[PDB]
Every structure is written in structure tokens, then in C-alpha cells.
Design a protein around this ligand. Structure first.
Ligand code: CYC
Ligand code: CYC
Ligand code: CYC
Ligand code: CYC
Ligand code: CYC
Ligand code: CYC
Ligand code: CYC
Lengths: 51, 162, 172, 162, 172, 162
């Protein structure tokens, strides 16, 4: 909700591998936020449509 | 919009570097693909209306309950059939758009990204669209490598559906 | 972010005195009808997905330009975002009629979403008509007493229609 | 696990403060709820097996195609009926668990959180489960405020389904 | 994270000399059969959802204890996570046979996932049998020819079965 | 037994003459018909059991009173359903027989000639069979000219019923 917005919480945007790494404690919440902000759906929808 | 040249530019931009021989390899490969893919897209454009009607009839054949029960999600009335065959033509048009674009980008941006919540909200079974795409990939009548990559795009739509 | 009680408390603090007696009788009647407020709220809440699907169902039957290619809600992703926007508006309506104050609905949606729909190119008219139809269907779903004791929902149809009209006018 | 006492502790912990009168208001309200809800859960426990069979028969009645067509997702064979009525009893057991727990937490953790992708992968229509939950909420036979909040939980499951 | 070519480059750099001629003839034959490698990936990839559903379909027919209450894959959420774990394993198999090296499959899932399944209480035996059945079905789906040119798939059936057995043994 | 070659021989015999070019025109036309009709009859033979069950379920759906009221004409008990679906399969088998024979002769001799007095004596409504034949002609799933003449035979049975 913080990184994508509510309208971008689609089943197709979900990073299932990052969620399993977070739930297993392999990555921090910070690294999860970095993984979301560097994800393909974020870059396509939010980076490519802006200056 | 995952198309090969766009994603090559995205790779070179995120790396912060100029273009290398890698993107030119991507390019001679993309031109090799398009050299048959554009004519295959034109052939699908020719056979499109009969393919849409055949897919709709095969969908009514495999799922006969949708023609019978009263319900605005089902195509029992005529407006269901108009809207229904409209989204058949939508699926076929997205297949041709991905054939021209050279990647799964157009279907991923126009169809896939919200299709799950739409079928959840509207009581549409995705298996109907799977049956229609199977009929299209059986009956498109292409041959060779164009036929294989057309079947690749349709199978990608099937795997994105269910 | 205000209740009814916090609204009376903030008004009494801005006055600087204690709460007057007539406001306390009003709040006692509010405490008597707050559950009454609630019954509509729970029967409004339980049918929310049917409400938003029927609202989009009538809206896209009414304005087929949005479904038409090049339309604002044409793309599958955009159409899912459309249903998400409608469901969010209905949820904050239910929150505002839960707390009994429109300040939560104002705080969470209204001041920004008009500018958002301008900047997005979203037609404010269609979503205004959709919120109006959703509110009409919501009061129509709330007012029917199926397996419910006989009571009076008058003033609360008044309040719910007020919240829906405030949302539809702040959308524009 | 969204239950009222758990979420009150979560509020007081995330705020970093002790418990206030707000959580005690939550508590006398929760005890008021449980004082009828536990007996209603026992009554549902009593009527459970007949409700499960009636829901399965109503689901076979409204969707007669599932009994007819060959397919491992459909309950045409006997193992489909065993597994099918097993997930009917699953839904009813989650309803009773939320009646005991006092919140939608148990169904949200045991049913809802993955049901969409499961019905997507397995070609299960959620409308079958909507019909079954509608039959259960029609035929549970409770009365009064326990009946209203039981219908609330079942309607919550319906809205989470479609 | 290695290719075939980067593997030969790293080995030639650890040797410190240039690439020998026989390795270049091997890489020329690899470049001739790399598209051949590709057809299996192309036809392995297109049927992936059918592969994982049939694999879980046979596995949960085979071990009904997982579906039984108290079983590890009993809960709906856990069962969805189960199918997600299987689909991830199949995807990294397809990546490793794309790049022609098992180092991507090692890097991505093998080292950690054994300890993950120990810590979770996940039985490694069932998922090992499921990856084995999925690999058997994957080679069975890849090997059949429909309107396909006659060709020899032996060393690539060899390589794909190698990748699947490496995954199943690293799972344990 | 109104089949084209039989009635051509009957014309030439009642006229007292030899065969002319008229009967040979009838013959090249009949062979043109059979050249698709035999394969269409084989396809109906393949889809027959599911079509019979779907027609019986559609008949129970449109006329739900027949499943409920006690009566030996109604299919409330199980023997009514066995006999009922037996005469569904009878109707479908006569459709396939007329598809092979190339004329309405087999249904006219095996079904039509006494069906009115039988439905009069047995309190069977013919509208049940009309609904079943409508479901069959909707759900047979053929295409093209074979589908049109199959619908012709089924519509002939409908017009002979009511
Ligand atoms: C359907 C009723 C109408 C419609 C909806 C629509 N909205 C969007 C996109 C956005 N909507 C919002 C709105 C909100 N975000 C919030 O957080 C809140 C309050 C909590 C509200 C009211 C925002 C921020 C966006 C943009 C970002 C996003 O993911 O959703 C779209 C899609 C536009 C796009 O290009 O994606 C649509 C279609 N539009 C219509 O056509 C109807 C009139
Ligand atoms: C409103 C549109 C219709 C209406 C409602 C109405 N309700 C009441 C009284 C009660 N309603 C409830 C409901 C609940 N209490 C709970 O704890 C829950 C679970 C969340 C529910 C569903 C209850 C319990 C009461 C009061 C206490 C009781 O019933 O035991 C009234 C009259 C009493 C009051 O003002 O609260 C009315 C009128 N009646 C209509 O005619 C409208 C169509
Ligand atoms: C360009 C990509 C694209 C797709 C795929 C798409 C699908 C789509 N199909 C819809 C409805 C529909 N979809 C169907 C389709 C069917 N139902 C059946 O019984 C048949 C099996 C099947 C015929 C193919 C029907 C009948 C409706 C109208 C039902 C409705 O009110 O929602 C709707 C809701 C809009 C509306 O209510 O009119 C969307 C968004 N829209 C898009 O923009
Ligand atoms: C505790 C909460 C919970 C739920 C809800 C649940 C559902 C659930 N139902 C399943 C299958 C199934 N679900 C159904 C159900 C039906 N099909 C029909 O035709 C009928 C209309 C309906 C009968 C109710 C059937 C027949 C299967 C077996 C099909 C299969 O192989 O996947 C599966 C896959 C497991 C398997 O294949 O055996 C899950 C996870 N599991 C859970 O743990
Ligand atoms: C990219 C590589 C990668 C792998 C391999 C991976 C595995 C992985 N599987 C997990 C859970 C799981 N994995 C399984 C799978 C199974 N359990 C069974 O019963 C069967 C034997 C088997 C089905 C084949 C199940 C059921 C869970 C759920 C455990 C739980 O949620 O409590 C979890 C815990 C967090 C979570 O799923 O949401 C991780 C991290 N994660 C990764 O990021
Ligand atoms: C990404 C889109 C794409 C595809 C799909 C593709 C496939 C493809 N497979 C080829 C060859 C081939 N493909 C096969 C595959 C097999 N033969 C068998 O009998 C086995 C069962 C099976 C492997 C399991 C064989 C044997 C050849 C012979 C030519 C060669 O070695 O490439 C070739 C060589 C050039 C040509 O056919 O014109 C193409 C194009 N090329 C593309 O650009
Ligand atoms: C080959 C051509 C052919 C046809 C068409 C045929 C019909 C036929 N149906 C009969 C009875 C029947 N027909 C029905 C049928 C139905 N009743 C219902 O409620 C359903 C709507 C419908 C199911 C399709 C039933 C249940 C009977 C048994 C009732 C009886 O005692 O007479 C009988 C009386 C024989 C008997 O009593 O068993 C005949 C002759 N027989 C033939 O030889």
C-alpha cells in the first residue's frame, strides 16, 4: 500500500519470492521495500510514466 | 510493455551505460522474428472474424449451461452474446498486437494485469476463455515457426488465466 | 478524524465551557439510536461487493464509452482500478456512518480525489453518477426489513444519503 | 487473526502505551457477544452434518452440470463428492470457529487468504461455494442476534469469495 | 549466475591462458544445439501450469496425508503456498536450462530451501517426489513431436533430467 | 420409410416406367448429402450420452414439477428417470437413423406415427420432448451444412410433436 498505492495491489504485481524471503527472515523490511521499489511492475507503472 | 527493444533500453539505462553488442544481438534477433511475425499477424487479421465465431461456438458447445441459465454473466440473452464475442475479439486482437510488438507486453498491459479481479467480481469463469484460446490456437491455420510462436503467445495467455 | 462525541467535545472546548444539558440529551438520544445507526451499517456492509458490482454493472450499461476502446475504464488494469476506486469510496462511506461524522469521509477521500481525477484524465461525471447510483442502491438495500424487528430508519436514511451526496459532490 | 482482544493488544502495543478504558469497553462488548455466540456455535455444531448434506444437495441442484461432465474438478465421480462435502464441512467449521473466536480472523487465516489463487489453479468456480453458503445461511435455523451475526460471518465469506 | 560461455571464460581465466581450441569447437557445437536446447524450453515453458497442476494432482492423490487435516499442505493458504513453491522450482529449472548451467538453479533455490523446509516442518520427501514427478512429466511433454522436425533430444533430455534430479536431491 | 432412393423407385414403379435422368439427379444429390451426413452421424454417436443427460437435466430444469409430484407418468421416482432418459436416447437414436438414411422415414415410422395417441393415453406432455429436442439442437455442436440439416430433422420432430 505504501510503495504501490491501493489501486496497484493486483495479483499480477505481487512479488511472491520477496514475500517468502521476508517471512523466512532472509531479508529485512527495508530490503523488502527496496525490492518493491525496484520491481518490474513499479518501474513500468510509476517510473516509465513520469519524469 | 515488455518488448525486446524497450527492455534493452531499460537494461542499458538502469545500468547507466551506453548500448553494447548485446542490444545489437537483441536487435538482429528481433528483426529475424518480425520478418515472419508481421505477415503472420496480417494472416490472423484476415481470418479473424471466422475464428471469433468459431471460438464462441466452441465455448457454447463445451459449456452449454451458459446458453441456458438466466443470468447477466451468462450469454443466455443476446446482449451477453454481443459482449461475449466482443471479448473474444478482444483476446484475438491482443494476440495480434503481441505478434506485431514482438513480446507479451500488450496482452500483459491490456488483458492480464486485472483479469483475475475482473473475473472474480463478475462471476466469469476463466475456463471459458481458456477453451476459446484453445480453439483459436487449434484453428488459426498458420504453419512453421510463426505458428509455434503464435501458440506460444496463446499458451502464455492460458497460463496467465489459470 | 472525529466522532460525534469528539465533535461535541471539540465544540465545547472551543466554547471553553462544559457541555450544556441539551447537547447531553441529544447525545443520549444518539446513544439510543447509535445501535439503530449500526443495524443499517451492518446490513449495508454485508452486501458491499454486490453493491459495487451492480453499480459498475448499471454504470457501464449506461455509459458504454468507458468500456469502448480509448475509454478511461477500457483497459483491464484500468477497469480493475475503477472497481477499486468505487469500493474504496463505499468503504469510507461505511466508516463515516459508523463513526457518525462526515469528517472521516472528508479526511480520507474528498480533498485530494477531485484533483486526482482531474490530473488522471478521469471523468468526474461518470464516477459521480456511479457513487449516486451506488448510494441509491445502498439505501434501497438498507431500508428493506427482511428478518429484522420493526423500527424507524428515517433520520439514518437522511444521514446516509447525506454522506453519499457529499461524496458525489466532492468528486464532481 | 483479527479477534477483538488481540487487535486491542496490538493497538495498545503499537501505540506503546498501557491499556485504557477503550480496551475495557471492547472487553465488556466482547463478553456481551460471546454470551450468546458460544451457545449459537454449539447449536451449529449440533445441526452441522445435515446442513452440510443439504448444502451439497442444493449445490448439485443449482449447478447440475457438475454432476454430469467428466472432470476431476467436477463432482461427477464419488471422490469428487467426498472431497466436495469435505470442503463444505470446512466452510461450516470455519464459520463455527469465527463464531467462537468473535471475529473474522479464523476464516481470514484458514480460508480467505489463498482461496482466489486456489480456485484459479483448480478450475473451481467460487459461485458453488456462494450457493452453499447461501443455503447454510438460509437453513441454519437460529434466531435473533446470534442469527444476525452468523449471517454476518457467512455474508463476509460470500463477499470474500466474489 | 553463470552461462555456458561465462563458465568457459571463468575456467580459462582461472587457467590464466586463452581458450583452447577444443573448448571452442565444443562451444561451436553448443551454439549449434543451443537453439535445439531452446525448443524444449519453448515447449516446456508453454505447459507449465498444466505441469504443476498435474504434479500436485498426482502427489496429493499419492500422499493423502498432506490433504488430511493436520497435514502440512492441508490449509488453503498453505496449499496455495505449496503450489507456489512447486511453480518456483519449475521456473528456476526453466531458467537453468535456458542459460545451460545449473549454477542459476543452485544460486536461486537449492542452498537455502533445504534448511527452509526443515525449519518450516515441511516434509522434504513429498516435495522431492513431486519435483521428480514434475520432471518426469516435463520430459514426457518435451519429448513428443507434433508437427516437429525429427531431431535428437538425448543430450537435452540428459541435461533436463540432470537439472530435475539436482533439484530433487538438493531438496531432500 | 420416406428415403429418397426408395421414393424414387416408388415414383418410377407407380408411373410404370424405367428409371430416367430424374432419379440419377436424385442420386448424385443423395450422395452429396450422405458424404457429410455419415460423418455427422458418427459425431452425434460420439457425443450421444452427454447429450442425453444434458437434455434430461434441461427437461427437469424447465419443468420442475415432474420431479416433485407423485405419479407414474412423472419422473419423480428412479424408474421414471430410467424410462425417461431411455426415451431421450430413443429420440436421439432416431435422429441419427434419419441422418444415416437421408430422410425423415425412420423417425416417421418409429416415432411419429403413434406418438400422439401414446402421449394421450399416458398423460405425457409432448412439450417435455420439445424442450429436450431444443436442448439437443442447441447443444449438438456440429457446424455447417450438416448442422443445418440436423437441425432440420430435429425441427421436423418438433413440428410433428406440436
Ligand atoms: C470508475 C468509478 C471511475 C474511474 C476510476 C479510476 N480511478 C483510477 C486511478 C486512481 N484512482 C485513485 C483514487 C484514490 N486513491 C486513493 O488512495 C483514494 C482514497 C483512499 C482514492 C479515491 C488514484 C490515486 C489513482 C491513480 C493510481 C492508481 O493505481 O490507481 C483509474 C485508472 C487510471 C490509470 O491510468 O490507471 C480509473 C479507471 N475512472 C473511470 O473511468 C470512472 C469514471
Ligand atoms: C433499519 C433500516 C431497520 C430497523 C432496525 C432496527 N434495529 C433495532 C435494534 C437492534 N438491532 C440489533 C442488531 C444487532 N445487535 C448486535 O449486536 C448485532 C451484531 C453486530 C446486530 C445485528 C440489536 C441487537 C438491536 C437492539 C437490541 C436487541 O435487539 O436485542 C431497532 C429497534 C431497537 C433499537 O433502536 O436498537 C430497529 C428499528 N428497523 C426497521 O424497521 C428498519 C427497516
Ligand atoms: C481488451 C481486453 C478486455 C477483456 C478480456 C475484457 C472483459 C470484460 N468482460 C466483461 C463482461 C462480460 N464478459 C462476458 C463473456 C462471456 N460470458 C459468457 O457467458 C461467455 C462464456 C463469455 C463470452 C466470451 C459477458 C457476457 C459479459 C457481460 C457480463 C457483464 O455484465 O458484466 C467486462 C465488464 C464490462 C461490462 O460489464 O460490460 C470486462 C471488463 N474487457 C477488456 O477490455
Ligand atoms: C479449511 C479451508 C479449506 C478449503 C475451502 C479447501 C479447498 C480445496 N478444495 C480442493 C479441491 C476440491 N474442491 C472440490 C469441491 C467442489 N467441486 C465441485 O464440483 C463441487 C461444486 C464442490 C463441492 C463443495 C472438489 C471436488 C475438489 C477435488 C478436485 C481437485 O483435484 O483438485 C483443494 C485442492 C486439494 C485437492 O486437490 O484435494 C483445496 C485446497 N481446502 C481447505 O483446506
Ligand atoms: C526462490 C526460491 C524459494 C523457495 C524454494 C521458497 C520456499 C518457501 N516455502 C515456504 C512455505 C511452504 N512451502 C510449502 C510446500 C510444500 N509443503 C508441503 O507440504 C509439500 C511437501 C510441499 C509442496 C510441494 C508449504 C505448504 C508452505 C507453507 C508453510 C506455511 O505457510 O506454514 C516458505 C515460507 C514463507 C512463505 O511461503 O510464504 C518459503 C520461504 N521460497 C523461496 O523464495
Ligand atoms: C522461439 C521461436 C522459435 C522456435 C519455436 C524455433 C524452433 C525451431 N526448431 C528448429 C529445429 C529443430 N527442432 C527440433 C526439435 C525436436 N525434434 C524431435 O524429433 C524432438 C522430439 C524435438 C526436441 C525434443 C529438431 C530435431 C530440429 C532440427 C533442426 C535443428 O537442429 O535446429 C528450428 C530450425 C530452423 C527452422 O526450423 O526453420 C527452428 C526454427 N525457432 C524459433 O525461432
Ligand atoms: C423409439 C421411439 C419410442 C418412444 C419415444 C417411446 C415412448 C414411450 N414412453 C413411454 C413411457 C414413459 N415416458 C416417460 C418420459 C418422461 N416422463 C417424464 O416425466 C419426463 C419429462 C420424460 C423423460 C424423457 C416416462 C417416465 C415413462 C414411463 C411412464 C409410463 O408408465 O407409462 C411408453 C409406454 C411404455 C411404458 O409404459 O414403459 C412409450 C411407448 N417408446 C418408443 O418406442
Amino acid at each position: 500500500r505504501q510503495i504501490f498505492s491501493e489501486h496497484q495491489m493486483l495479483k499480477s504485481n505481487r512479488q511472491t519470492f520477496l514475500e517468502s524471503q521476508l517471512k523466512f527472515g532472509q531479508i529485512t523490511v527495508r530490503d523488502f521495500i527496496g525490492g518493491l521499489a525496484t520491481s518490474a511492475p513499479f518501474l513500468e507503472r510509476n517510473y516509465q510514466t513520469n519524469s | 510493455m515488455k518488448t525486446p527493444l524497450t527492455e534493452a533500453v531499460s537494461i542499458a539505462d538502469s545500468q547507466g551505460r551506453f548500448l553494447s553488442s548485446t542490444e545489437i544481438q537483441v536487435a538482429f534477433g528481433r528483426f529475424r522474428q518480425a520478418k515472419a511475425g508481421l505477415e503472420a499477424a496480417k494472416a490472423l487479421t484476415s481470418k479473424a472474424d471466422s475464428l471469433i465465431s468459431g471460438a464462441a461456438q466452441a465455448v457454447y458447445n463445451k459449456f452449454p449451461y451458459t446458453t441456458q441459465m438466466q443470468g447477466p454473466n451468462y450469454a443466455a440473452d443476446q446482449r451477453g452474446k454481443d459482449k461475449c464475442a466482443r471479448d473474444i475479439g478482444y483476446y484475438l486482437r491482443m494476440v495480434t498486437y503481441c505478434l506485431i510488438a514482438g513480446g507479451t507486453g500488450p496482452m500483459d498491459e491490456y488483458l492480464i494485469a486485472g483479469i483475475d479481479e475482473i473475473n472474480r467480481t463478475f462471476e466469469l469463469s476463466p475456463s471459458w476463455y481458456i477453451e476459446a484460446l484453445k480453439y483459436i490456437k487449434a484453428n488459426h491455420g498458420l504453419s512453421g515457426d510463426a505458428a509455434v510462436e503464435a501458440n506460444s503467445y496463446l499458451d502464455y495467455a492460458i497460463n496467465a488465466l489459470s | 478524524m472525529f466522532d460525534a462525541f469528539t465533535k461535541v467535545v471539540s465544540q465545547a472546548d472551543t466554547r471553553g465551557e462544559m457541555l450544556s444539558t441539551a447537547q447531553i440529551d441529544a447525545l443520549s438520544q444518539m446513544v439510543a439510536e447509535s445501535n439503530k445507526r449500526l443495524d443499517s451499517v451492518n446490513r449495508i456492509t454485508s452486501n458491499a461487493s454486490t453493491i459495487v458490482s451492480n453499480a459498475a454493472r448499471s454504470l457501464f450499461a449506461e455509459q458504454p464509452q468507458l468500456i469502448a476502446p480509448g475509454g478511461n475504464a477500457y483497459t483491464s488494469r484500468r477497469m480493475a482500478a475503477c472497481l477499486r476506486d468505487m469500493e474504496i469510496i463505499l468503504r469510507y462511506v461505511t466508516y463515516a456512518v459508523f463513526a457518525g461524522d462526515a469528517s472521516v469521509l472528508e479526511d480520507r477521500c474528498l480533498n485530494g480525489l477531485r484533483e486526482t481525477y482531474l490530473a488522471l484524465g478521469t471523468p468526474g461525471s461518470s464516477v459521480a453518477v456511479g457513487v449516486g447510483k451506488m448510494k441509491e442502491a445502498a439505501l434501497a438495500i438498507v431500508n428493506d426489513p427482511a428478518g429484522i424487528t420493526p423500527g424507524d430508519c428515517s433520520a439514518l436514511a437522511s444521514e446516509i444519503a447525506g454522506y453519499f451526496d457529499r461524496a458525489a459532490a466532492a468528486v464532481s
